[PDB]
A = this chain, B = another copy of it.
Amino acid sequence: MKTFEILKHLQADAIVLFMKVHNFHWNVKGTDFFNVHKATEEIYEEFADMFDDLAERIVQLGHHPLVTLSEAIKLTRVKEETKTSFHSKDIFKEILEDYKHLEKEFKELSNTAEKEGDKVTVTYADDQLAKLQKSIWMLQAHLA
């Protein structure tokens, strides 16, 4: 609910999503393999970058970012994926739903940070929103 709390929960989602997409990356099979293998590598590296960005946002608010993977699992709103076989369509469907979750949270981040006069977090949140809106649009087109 507070800005740093939204950030910390997003940092948890970021690494959990990194792991989820890492799973997809190595376990994707079928005629779409080559495209999905490449796309998922880009997607999980973006989540790795987001993890780093969010940590930076947290310290500048005078708080500690995630300390452990145990803490990431605690705070995450993302369900971890235990399956190792999917079809490529289901991979993109899953990632889309996760992006939609993130968009909702970054919207809340922006609004909450604005109310506190936290101009830097607002900028960061709005920039992430632009990236997410593009990713969502492309996955929606792919799945249409």
Contacts and interface: CB of A to CB of B under 8 A. Distances in A.
Contact of A126 (B58, B70, B120): B120
Nearest to A58: B26
Contact of A64 (B72, B84, B124, B141): B84
A93 interface: no
Interface string A119-144: 11011111101100110011001101
A27 B15 CA distance: 19
> What interface size band does chain A fall in?
35 or more
Tell me how many chains of this kind the complex includes: 12
Given A37-B141, A70-B73, A120-B133, 9 more contacts: A23-B65, A26-B65, A28-B141, A33-B138, A68-B80, A107-B119, A123-B126, A123-B127, A123-B130
5 contacts: A33-B141, A33-B142, A60-B133, A60-B137, A120-B133
